[PDB]
């Protein structure tokens, strides 16, 4: 059984966090759990029958995820699974990241584990022409230091923020505190426009010519580095055209340290418009 969904609480504080703990990327879509069918976070079915079908029959009994449509909006993937559709056939994809099995008195690390071997078991489960399944097999911790860095790292990505753990955790049946600690939220990254200024060549000889490799900065008086959050899309584009794009506007990410203006892990989002 689940009988209430388990919702997260969220963090006021980041060195707030117990150690050796797990830790996953936060899914930015409608959230659903298997008990016969698949259902919506209130426990009414999943009214894209299609949708509901395809998971029913892919996941096993208590999985607990998130539908989303790769790379649509968090509105139109509403539209996807909160339409009820007879014969949906456009591709998306279903986070997995809970496995209940029986027993929620058994620990996150377990329930986990369950969740690997039933993949391992089943592997088609990742394989599906129109269902793409994507199991979040949490990460370990053990620094704040090594938070941080997940939570930059997961950005870069292209995911919200980061979910945090309790290994021993149970399945609560609703929503975990603070101290508790079984799901927390994490937003601690700062999203800021930002001017660059000079790049520096790259450096030659949960997924399943010289190029940038990093740029210097300004954003309101300070001076540092992004290395990290570009591609050989964009890294390939900033380097060709460099005195092109010296001074023009970069949506960047950050988290603040100790009393300095000077972020810890920035990561670039995206090249900034230039319209009205």
């Known amino acids: 059984a689940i009988t209430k969904p388990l919702l997260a609480a969220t963090l006021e504080n980041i060195e707030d966090v117990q150690f050796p703990c797990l830790a996953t990327p936060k899914i930015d879509g409608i959230r659903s759990v298997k008990q016969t069918q698949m259902l919506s976070r209130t426990f009414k079915p999943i009214r894209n029958s299609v949708m509901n079908r395809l998971l029913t029959e892919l996941l096993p009994e208590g999985s607990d995820g998130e539908i989303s449509i790769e790379g649509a909006t968090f509105q139109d993937t509403?539209?996807?699974?909160?339409?009820?559709?007879?014969?949906?056939?456009?591709?998306?994809?279903?986070?997995?990241?809970?496995?209940?099995?029986?027993?929620?008195?058994?620990?996150?690390?377990?329930?986990?584990?369950?969740?690997?071997?039933?993949?391992?078991?089943?592997?088609?489960?990742?394989?599906?022409?129109?269902?793409?399944?994507?199991?979040?097999?949490?990460?370990?911790?053990?620094?704040?230091?090594?938070?941080?860095?997940?939570?930059?790292?997961?950005?870069?990505?292209?995911?919200?923020?980061?979910?945090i753990r309790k290994p021993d955790g149970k399945y609560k049946f609703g929503r975990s505190t603070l101290k508790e600690g079984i799901l927390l939220k994490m937003k601690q990254f700062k999203d800021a426009e930002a001017t660059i200024i000079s790049m520096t060549a790259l450096?030659?000889?949960?997924?399943?010519?010289?190029?940038?490799?990093?740029?210097?900065?300004?954003?309101?008086?300070?001076?540092?580095?992004?290395?990290?959050?570009?591609?050989?899309?964009?890294?390939?584009?900033?380097?060709?055209?460099?005195?092109?794009?010296?001074?023009?506007?970069?949506k960047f990410k950050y988290f603040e340290m100790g009393s300095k203006d000077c972020p810890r892990f920035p990561v670039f989002i995206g090249i900034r418009h230039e319209e009205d």
């Open 78 to 163: 509403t539209s996807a699974v909160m339409t009820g559709h007879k014969m949906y056939n456009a591709k998306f994809s279903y986070y997995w990241f809970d496995y209940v099995t029986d027993d929620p008195l058994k620990k996150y690390i377990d329930r986990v584990e369950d969740m690997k071997n039933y993949i391992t078991v089943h592997p088609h489960i990742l394989e599906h022409a129109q269902v793409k399944i994507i199991p979040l097999i949490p990460v370990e911790i053990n620094n704040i230091t090594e938070l941080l860095q997940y939570e930059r790292d997961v950005l870069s990505k292209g995911f919200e923020g980061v979910m």
């Open 203 to 250: 450096f030659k000889n949960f997924g399943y010519e010289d190029v940038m490799g990093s740029i210097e900065v300004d954003y309101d008086g300070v001076v540092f580095s992004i290395g990290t959050g570009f591609d050989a899309d964009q890294r390939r584009d900033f380097w060709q055209n460099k005195e092109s794009y010296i001074g023009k506007m970069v």
